């Protein structure tokens, strides 16, 4: 072995930063470590605005969208040198066969278990149709066990319009798979949690997953289009979208990006690889597994209420 693994993936990576005129001091200081990902985006950054100017991102931030192309790429130079990091899987992403799109009405939760019907009021709205992961049965809606896998929608309905979406667009783009049509391409770290060693945190332990409508695809007229992938949105006009494991409405971060678009990340990934190398090494994004470490950890804190009285008891 001419030269070491190592030194395999750094002629590479620095082959693409030279390619793409990334910052001198990015280019010097990257050694190829699970954390930097920062000059791999710009790689893909320059590529973009070479190669895709009008590229449409929907729900999904031209930062997260860069960052993920990072990690997608990232992913295919330490498969192509065969360098590893025990404990640093490079996409921070996951294969979840959801089984949200199977049966009517109904969706799974991260358990791999039906969702159980809750009614979910905020303020007034009265959300009927909402749905919690069964170890949250008990609770108030969109509040949190110890078991909880965090994941929970005020609209089942729209909720799964979002699955049926992603699952005919990837029917769209791989029309002859033999697998992965039932999988969803999720990810599993937020900035929040992209280091193994980060600071424990409170609440959600994985991205947000939330249905958001797209209200004007249906304005639109279904015959005059005849993109596939484009008609999963007309027949499906909601989509799944990714934010921080707890979004602001504890740390909290911007990273937004939805179901198409970063399925798209990791696609266009493939595209800029294959221009600048004869072969796609293999690239495994693990398959989801649910195990207790995803938990959500939530904090019950009794709240007195409030008693004119001055005294608690009478005697
Ligand atoms: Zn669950
Ligand atoms: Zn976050």
Same mark, same amino acid.
């Given at each position: ?9 750094? !002629? ?24 930097? /990902? !920062? ?35 990232? =992913? ?95 029917? =769209? ?60 949105? /007309? ?12 979004? /602001? ?29 004869? !072969? ?18 939530? /904090? ?16």
């Amino acid at each position: 072995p001419i030269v070491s693994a190592w030194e395999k993936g750094m !002629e590479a990576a620095r082959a693409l930063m030279d390619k793409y005129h990334v910052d001198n001091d990015l280019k010097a200081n990257f050694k190829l470590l699970p954390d930097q /990902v !920062e000059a791999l985006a710009a790689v893909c950054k320059t590529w973009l605005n070479e190669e895709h100017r009008g590229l449409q991102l929907t729900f999904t931030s031209n930062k997260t969208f860069v960052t993920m192309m990072g990690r997608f790429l990232q =992913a295919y130079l330490q498969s192509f040198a065969e360098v590893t990091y025990k404990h640093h899987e490079p996409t921070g992403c996951a294969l979840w066969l959801h089984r949200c799109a199977e049966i009517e009405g109904e969706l799974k939760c991260l358990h791999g278990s039906i969702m159980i019907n809750k009614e979910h009021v905020i303020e007034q709205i009265s959300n009927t149709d909402a749905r919690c992961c069964v170890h949250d049965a008990a609770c108030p809606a969109n509040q949190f066990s110890g078991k909880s896998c965090g994941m929970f929608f005020s609209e089942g309905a729209k909720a799964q319009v979002a699955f049926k979406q992603i699952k005919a667009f990837m029917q =769209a783009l791989y029309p002859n798979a033999q697998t992965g049509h039932g999988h969803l391409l999720m990810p599993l770290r937020c900035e929040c949690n992209s280091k193994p060693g980060h600071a424990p945190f409170l609440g959600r332990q994985l991205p947000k997953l939330t249905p958001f409508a797209l209200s004007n695809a249906e304005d639109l007229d279904a015959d005059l289009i005849s993109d596939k992938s484009v008609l999963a949105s /007309v027949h499906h006009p909601a989509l799944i979208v990714f934010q921080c494991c707890n979004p /602001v409405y504890g740390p909290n971060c911007d990273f937004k990006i939805s179901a198409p678009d970063l399925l798209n990340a990791l696609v266009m990934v493939r595209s800029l690889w294959s221009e600048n190398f004869t !072969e796609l090494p293999r690239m495994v994004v693990p398959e989801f597994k649910w195990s207790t470490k995803h938990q959500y950890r939530p /904090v019950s804190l009794p709240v007195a209420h409030s008693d004119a009285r001055q005294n608690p008891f009478d005697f």
